[PDB]
User: What shape does this take?
Amino acid sequence: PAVRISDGNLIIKNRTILTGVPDNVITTSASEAGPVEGVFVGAVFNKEESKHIVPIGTLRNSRFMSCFRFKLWWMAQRMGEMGRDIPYETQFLLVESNKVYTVFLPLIEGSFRSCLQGNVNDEVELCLESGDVDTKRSSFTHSLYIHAGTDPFQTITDAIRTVKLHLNSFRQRHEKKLPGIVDYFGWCTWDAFYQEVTQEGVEAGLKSLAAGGTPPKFVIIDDGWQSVERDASPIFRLTGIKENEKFKKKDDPNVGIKNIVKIAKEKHGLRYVYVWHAITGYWGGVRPGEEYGSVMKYPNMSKGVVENDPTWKTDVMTLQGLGLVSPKKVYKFYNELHSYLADAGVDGVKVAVQCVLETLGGGLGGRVELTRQFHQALDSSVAKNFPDNGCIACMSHNTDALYCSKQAAVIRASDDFYPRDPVSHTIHIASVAYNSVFLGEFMQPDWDMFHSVHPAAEYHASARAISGGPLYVSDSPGKHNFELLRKLVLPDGSILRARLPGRPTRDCLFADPARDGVSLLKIWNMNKYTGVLGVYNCQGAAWSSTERKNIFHQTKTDSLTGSIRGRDVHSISEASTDPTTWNGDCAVYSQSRGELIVMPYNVSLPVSLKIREHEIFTVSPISHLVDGVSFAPIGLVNMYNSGGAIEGLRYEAEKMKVVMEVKGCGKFGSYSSVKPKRCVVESNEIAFEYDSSSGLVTFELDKMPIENKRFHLIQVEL
Ligand SMILES: OC[C@H]1O[C@H](OC[C@@H]2O[C@H](O[C@]3(CO)O[C@H](CO)[C@H](O)[C@@H]3O)[C@H](O)[C@@H](O)[C@@H]2O)[C@@H](O)[C@H](O)[C@@H]1O
Assistant: This one.
């Protein structure tokens, strides 16, 4: 077929990937769909137990990259050559045999959830768990899926499709409705006030940002608005669905969060208002009580999580427990909550603490069946009450939840932005890129909030710009960098969102740019008519396998050199108006240096960077109109994702004309191999500059497109 087991070996296009597959491991190419290009894998065991480890075979001398849970809530990256290097809790694994790429998807099957892990003998072990000592099983047929192909990202997509067609319990990213917040700049209260947020806090924040010319059009009222109590650092539990004191106008206390929602929308011009809540109500769940059938439960410890995060064994939540709402009443709980919120004008929720459900499998059906039931009810309640699909999933990097991700369309792709922890910044940019390789198959990644005023602001902000996801800050009011923010946000609060999850280049997939001391991390994305490439140095910090937390670690040179090729933007062909006849030549524009460079296909351009430095490049395919006349739009050169502005593009070779639809305002740049005769913006000739040495054509779009008539129409005549 292409992937087979014969002898005791796993073979993929005649390369031996695994040796010593034990005889009880069985393959099958049947879903109901039904023949299938890769292979499903499970095993038969002697006894009917609620857990199994089972070697799959022995990995040696094949580069792999993995996404593995280093906390319960979150994944990050790990590269190796050998089985022993594969961490506990590995949820996805990609393997390069050297040309050919292979993906391993441990899956949910019935009431069980797989992940991978390695042992010291270099075996890849599958780990099946029901997370409920009463749900037990002896055989498994479809608990890992393996599939190969020649394009690493296409390989991943095809494999997720195939898993989707087996399970029918989720939708791929591209098939879900994104909520409208992804198109606008936002503000999150969380880093501004933490749990001490108030409604006066909210207003001040929306005011200062609008003052500086970059207005948020959404806001996330983060953890802090809910009514909660300790029992009587002890844990808080939800006492009501309605807002605490800080969100009732100080005058008519019967008016609640409706007040701040109105202030934000009518007074400060926001389109969307989102609020935070745990999947379980609050951190300690809901106060035990017959209303929602709430009952104290204690997180069960699974071996792999505890192995990577030892501190989870003594977390507030583990030791003090949570009031878990009953599955029978969980819809009721979310509907009552969300109906209150929505009928107050709230458009969406940011749903945190999602992974706990896996630990509360209790006597309730297990990790998979309880995660399902809660997610089914959350969705129903979201589709009823926030029907722009206003769900942001946070702290949910388990396959329990990803494989029943049917509706929700936006996922935080890492652990939090930490303004005060200097260790975190490089790790953030790496965890976000690597997890988006796999998380972006399901939901649109969210690179999380950041500070415009921070030593690492431009580092974080460039990443946000090229992430594909919502762009927001969590600034405290008045502490803003609007020179910075205008590179991301147009006068009306819109952004230049790229189309895909921001991901590492083919080049970077198997080299760990946090740990190897040698490579720069290159992130790629696409717009309609350009690509875009971020280059970062994210070296010298990472999750330690020994210390089991984020540490700094030693780094040899200060400055690393890599290189950039147009083809590093993996899908750059899609931006060409004529892919059949395109030679591969790209206009590359260094957004930070201000320089335009023509890059023939093949040709490299070196890039040097110290730790925490970055460079963003817009990559536009060059169109050859006639011999000597070549063109490629850049977009808005003083914005990070400059190419996000070009909504339309057409070449008229017969008349020597480029016609463009450009959104936004500010300086517009293009590469032209000859000086233009004219540039025209809405039927009016305009002033432009040309640098004959580089090709750079430049003029000013002075104002936002007028109307109600969304784009500037620009003709360039050559
Ligand atoms: O609480 C609001 C915040 O929750 C989401 O997750 C934060 C999570 O909490 C843990 O971080 C710490 C540990 O003490 O708890 C608070 C956050 O409540 C601190 O900021 C600490 O860093 C945990 O270690 C984290 O891994 C976890 O992400 C977060 O996604 C949202 O930002 C939300 O505002």
Summary: The chain has 13 helices and 47 strands. Residues 71, 73-74, 190, 222-223, 352, 394-395, 412, 415-416 surround ligand 1 (CB under 6 Å).
